[PDB]
Design an enzyme around this catalytic site. Sequence first.
Site, mmCIF file in Angstrom:
data_model
loop_
_atom_site.group_PDB
_atom_site.id
_atom_site.type_symbol
_atom_site.label_atom_id
_atom_site.label_comp_id
_atom_site.label_asym_id
_atom_site.label_seq_id
_atom_site.Cartn_x
_atom_site.Cartn_y
_atom_site.Cartn_z
ATOM 1 N N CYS B 106 0.771 -1.107 0.048
ATOM 2 C CA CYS B 106 -0.043 0.097 0.007
ATOM 3 C C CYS B 106 0.799 1.324 -0.074
ATOM 4 O O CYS B 106 1.533 1.496 0.913
ATOM 5 C CB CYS B 106 -0.847 0.161 1.136
ATOM 6 S SG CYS B 106 -1.970 1.425 0.967
ATOM 7 N N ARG B 109 -0.367 4.656 2.650
ATOM 8 C CA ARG B 109 -0.350 4.605 4.172
ATOM 9 C C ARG B 109 -0.133 5.700 4.864
ATOM 10 O O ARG B 109 -0.245 5.504 6.340
ATOM 11 C CB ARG B 109 0.532 3.252 4.529
ATOM 12 C CG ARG B 109 -0.156 2.032 4.229
ATOM 13 C CD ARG B 109 1.047 0.864 4.590
ATOM 14 N NE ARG B 109 2.039 0.671 3.487
ATOM 15 C CZ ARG B 109 3.329 0.035 3.786
ATOM 16 N NH1 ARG B 109 3.365 -0.539 4.962
ATOM 17 N NH2 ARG B 109 4.032 -0.275 3.192
HETATM 18 C C1 HEM Z 1 -6.426 6.583 1.382
HETATM 19 C C2 HEM Z 1 -6.242 6.480 0.152
HETATM 20 C C3 HEM Z 1 -5.339 5.102 -0.336
HETATM 21 C C4 HEM Z 1 -4.598 5.054 -1.403
HETATM 22 C C5 HEM Z 1 -4.378 6.247 -2.359
HETATM 23 C C6 HEM Z 1 -4.198 3.911 -1.647
HETATM 24 C C7 HEM Z 1 -3.130 3.468 -2.587
HETATM 25 C C8 HEM Z 1 -2.972 1.971 -3.036
HETATM 26 C C9 HEM Z 1 -2.373 1.418 -4.155
HETATM 27 C C10 HEM Z 1 -2.439 2.341 -5.293
HETATM 28 C C11 HEM Z 1 -2.618 -0.096 -4.025
HETATM 29 C C12 HEM Z 1 -2.118 -0.783 -5.068
HETATM 30 C C13 HEM Z 1 -3.255 -1.199 -5.724
HETATM 31 C C14 HEM Z 1 -3.275 -2.022 -7.085
HETATM 32 O O1 HEM Z 1 -2.121 -1.939 -7.609
HETATM 33 O O2 HEM Z 1 -4.297 -2.708 -7.487
HETATM 34 C C15 HEM Z 1 -2.805 -0.213 -2.698
HETATM 35 C C16 HEM Z 1 -2.714 -1.618 -2.048
HETATM 36 C C17 HEM Z 1 -3.309 -1.621 -1.006
HETATM 37 N N1 HEM Z 1 -3.963 -0.924 0.046
HETATM 38 FE FE1 HEM Z 1 -4.059 1.135 -0.286
HETATM 39 N N2 HEM Z 1 -4.450 3.153 -0.401
HETATM 40 C C18 HEM Z 1 -5.300 3.696 0.251
HETATM 41 C C19 HEM Z 1 -5.952 3.457 1.399
HETATM 42 C C20 HEM Z 1 -6.027 1.847 1.835
HETATM 43 C C21 HEM Z 1 -7.070 1.668 2.869
HETATM 44 C C22 HEM Z 1 -8.164 2.546 3.470
HETATM 45 C C23 HEM Z 1 -6.797 0.265 3.097
HETATM 46 C C24 HEM Z 1 -7.417 -0.774 3.962
HETATM 47 C C25 HEM Z 1 -7.690 -0.075 4.933
HETATM 48 C C26 HEM Z 1 -5.702 -0.167 1.916
HETATM 49 C C27 HEM Z 1 -5.044 -1.394 2.126
HETATM 50 C C28 HEM Z 1 -4.416 -1.709 0.848
HETATM 51 C C29 HEM Z 1 -4.149 -3.127 0.668
HETATM 52 C C30 HEM Z 1 -4.275 -4.276 1.717
HETATM 53 C C31 HEM Z 1 -3.397 -3.030 -0.407
HETATM 54 C C32 HEM Z 1 -2.776 -4.401 -0.980
HETATM 55 C C33 HEM Z 1 -3.504 -5.239 -2.023
HETATM 56 C C34 HEM Z 1 -3.288 -6.236 -2.542
HETATM 57 O O3 HEM Z 1 -2.139 -6.997 -1.957
HETATM 58 O O4 HEM Z 1 -3.578 -7.063 -3.440
HETATM 59 N N3 HEM Z 1 -5.384 1.206 1.425
HETATM 60 N N4 HEM Z 1 -3.123 1.009 -1.776
#
Ligand code: HEM
Lengths: 404, 402
Positions: B106, B109
């Site tokens: 992510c 974060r």
């Molecule tokens: C607040 C704005 C946020 C942005 C801009 C963001 C950005 C990202 C991006 C770009 C990815 C890669 C996604 C992909 O390539 O398909 C990601 C992965 C992830 N984010 Fe975020 N994120 C945000 C909030 C969150 C929130 C609220 C959570 C959970 C509470 C979260 C949990 C994750 C997780 C678990 C992954 C990994 C998914 C996987 O392994 O397939 N993120 N994040």
Amino acid sequence: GPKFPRVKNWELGSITYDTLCAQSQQDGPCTPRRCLGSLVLPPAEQLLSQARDFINQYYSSIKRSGSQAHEERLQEVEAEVASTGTYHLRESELVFGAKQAWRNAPRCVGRIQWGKLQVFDARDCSSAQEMFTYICNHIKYATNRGNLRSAITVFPQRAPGRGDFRIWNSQLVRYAGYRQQDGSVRGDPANVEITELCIQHGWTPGNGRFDVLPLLLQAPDEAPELFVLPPELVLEVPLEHPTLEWFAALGLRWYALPAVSNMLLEIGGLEFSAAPFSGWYMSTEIGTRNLCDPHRYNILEDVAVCMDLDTRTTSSLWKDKAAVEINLAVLHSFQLAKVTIVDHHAATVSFMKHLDNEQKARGGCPADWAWIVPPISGSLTPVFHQEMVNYILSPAFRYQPDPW
Amino acid sequence: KFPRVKNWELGSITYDTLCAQSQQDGPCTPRRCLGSLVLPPAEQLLSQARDFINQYYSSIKRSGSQAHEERLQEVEAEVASTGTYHLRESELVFGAKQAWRNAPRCVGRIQWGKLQVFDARDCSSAQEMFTYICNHIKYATNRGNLRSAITVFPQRAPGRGDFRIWNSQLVRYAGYRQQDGSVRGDPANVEITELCIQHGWTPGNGRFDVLPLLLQAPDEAPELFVLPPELVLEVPLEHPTLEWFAALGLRWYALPAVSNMLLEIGGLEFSAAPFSGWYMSTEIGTRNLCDPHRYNILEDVAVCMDLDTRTTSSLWKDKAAVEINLAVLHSFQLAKVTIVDHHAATVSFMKHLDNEQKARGGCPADWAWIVPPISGSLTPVFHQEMVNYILSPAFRYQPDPW
Ligand code: HEM
Ligand code: HEM
Ligand SMILES: N=C(Nc1cccc(COC[C@@H]2C[C@H](OCc3cccc(NC(=N)c4cccs4)c3)CN2)c1)c1cccs1
Ligand SMILES: N=C(Nc1cccc(COC[C@@H]2C[C@H](OCc3cccc(NC(=N)c4cccs4)c3)CN2)c1)c1cccs1
Ligand SMILES: C[C@H](O)[C@H](O)[C@H]1CNc2nc(N)[nH]c(=O)c2N1
Ligand SMILES: C[C@H](O)[C@H](O)[C@H]1CNc2nc(N)[nH]c(=O)c2N1
Ligand SMILES: [Zn+2]
């Protein structure tokens, strides 16, 4: 499924299993607890087993494995190690090993070419002066007036008690980097340390942005000696853009021949501490990293300003747009000069073909995903969607400590 | 040895000591690195439980207190008698933030402390899941001023099926497999599309048909629920300077809300716990629209821009991609819908790395996932070494329920 790493391509849905990784004799930086794959830098009886292994590899590649010529070479190699502590490669063994080291290099996207390598045997070299002659000849051959040819020149191996042959420069062609009074750098910041070594060893420095450095060459147990490359040997390409007429006015340029000179070639436990190799550039190496890294020429803002972009805000994508035009300028200028270059699309496509070839040939291909994926337009290239397994095979090119 | 972590642009070095806290093995061994791969008793549960409770009481600075000790005993008494336990709502809230904090892939974060947690553990039917999902969407969307949220449905239990949302995101466009090879709409959603039809959904035939949800209560067939069109905010795509671009008829949804991951807190597992934030523009502009196995619009856009499509070395792909990303950023800004570009996002992630260094002594990150899919080395994260490892609480993958 099979007990080997399963490797997936997410664009095509296809799956392979890597069985070649089983032949890795050397640990990497990773453990079950943590992945360190993104880190850039992470004998007696020992010699003999490495030597036996390499000879087995040689005899497999000529299809004489288990034969009498194979068993005699092994005995020959152990006899030589028995009496001298070291041994020596046959000419054809060196050629095989040097190609296998390239083929084995996990960070190299250009490996479709691995079978096509001119190996210059310079194991007779006995002075810094002669190394210079050998290097000039390499450059002349490899440059070939712009129709570039992959080549490696191999100098004598490390030997018990005697000092190494070393080329001090990290590449045969490098632009000087001059530390300024205001703490900034004129030229290439990558090359500040080697520039100051060159001056310390008696080179009269220039003061331009693209001054070709002299070579610092070290024969065993002697201080290095300074050699100036005749400028007619160093092919350079002035950069222009195909439609932006002002880009030429920037006075940017790059050299044609990438020739890496600070790596150690290991074959069968033998260590070749001077063994410079060259190919041709992938265009993003020049246009993206060399010219746009903040710690390199850092020209992104200058070009964006000329393009009249909004450099005050990230969401204009001014950086992305400028980097693209700089990459186009590199491609166009090399094409116009008739100097071999490869764009990052053609390179990665060729690398996917290489992966398939090696799947069939050897059951896998060691590859470092972070290095293979180009630094612009990553997911636009087919390699981004390809899982890769990274491991060390020998013969290998290795980093070695700086000689100072 | 703890890993040495170098930034190559700045020359600075940190040491990651947090990775010593990792209990779960990743895919790598000393023989070979598998970092680029996308997919991977009572005392066992008891020690993940205590460890998590210890994390919680330490977080509130109340470690070793009466409250802490009596809570350890409650958890212990409940596992010993029943083989499981239940979290207090405040523990759940803390665990869900921690799972996000700990997610190595992510880039967003820096925001991890700002998460609205909806406790939906009193859910007993797919109908009730639907109502909770609608309130999540409504809250998180907030008329375009997007707010991060998670809704947590009842935990897995030994003797029954899981609560599951079958869809991988709450908003997904349909993908219709054509008799003649091709896909209409989003090819990533062919399988979920066909599952909806088979569960009685009347399909449309456009490129951007919002799918219904398939929601499942334990050991029951899933049920179909069409989202009210007014709940799904969408942004038509236009370009600041290229007028033919709007004519492409392209659009994306405002709300990225992931619904197929398992949330593990203290050894408890929440099989339905959809979470949402906002998009980074490259997710839409580069991946969803330009991946060859997604909407694959690069050629169309390059032809409209009149580029030389016959040769790789004209860099037509790179040029069209850039303009598509610009269109996404411009359109979201114009519609006043929260979005972050890859430069701003990665700069904030560097700040996050520094915050986490001071706070925890490291930060698990997955370089291949953190570095954006266009203009990699143009962002500061490219030049940054990273150490990937699994901390718990965690979001994990789980099997598809069909
Ligand atoms: C607040 C704005 C946020 C942005 C801009 C963001 C950005 C990202 C991006 C770009 C990815 C890669 C996604 C992909 O390539 O398909 C990601 C992965 C992830 N984010 Fe975020 N994120 C945000 C909030 C969150 C929130 C609220 C959570 C959970 C509470 C979260 C949990 C994750 C997780 C678990 C992954 C990994 C998914 C996987 O392994 O397939 N993120 N994040
Ligand atoms: C023929 C054209 C070739 C192309 C287009 C090419 C491309 C590349 C590129 C782009 C890199 C990464 C460089 C960087 O990011 O700084 C690389 C790494 C490498 N290539 Fe090649 N390559 C070619 C030929 C060769 C040859 C002839 C050899 C040696 C015989 C070689 C051995 C290597 C090695 C050892 C590395 C890794 C260096 C390191 O780990 O720091 N390649 N290749
Ligand atoms: N198109 C090409 N590009 C190309 C290919 C390979 C390499 C390069 C340029 O090199 C990449 C840079 C070069 C750089 O490595 C050089 C280096 C610098 C300083 C110290 C050390 N050594 C150590 N880390 C050690 C200390 C103690 C024990 S070890 C190595 C890393 N990253 C370009 C070709 C060159 C030759 C054929 S194709
Ligand atoms: N800006 C955002 N984007 C975002 C964040 C996270 C994730 C996504 C999109 O999802 C990424 C997709 C999701 C996808 O991973 C899920 C997946 C794919 C294939 C198989 C399996 N499972 C298995 N094979 C298993 C069998 C047995 C055990 S496991 C799981 C990869 N790639 C977007 C946000 C969403 C929510 C808050 S921010
Ligand atoms: C931190 C990271 O490992 C480092 O910046 C790498 C990323 N990928 C690279 N890839 C190539 N080809 N060359 C490089 O110098 C780098 N640098
Ligand atoms: C094979 C490779 O690991 C795979 O394509 C990864 C690379 N990096 C990624 N990065 C993000 N953010 N999202 C992704 O889906 C992927 N895919
Ligand atoms: Zn690894």
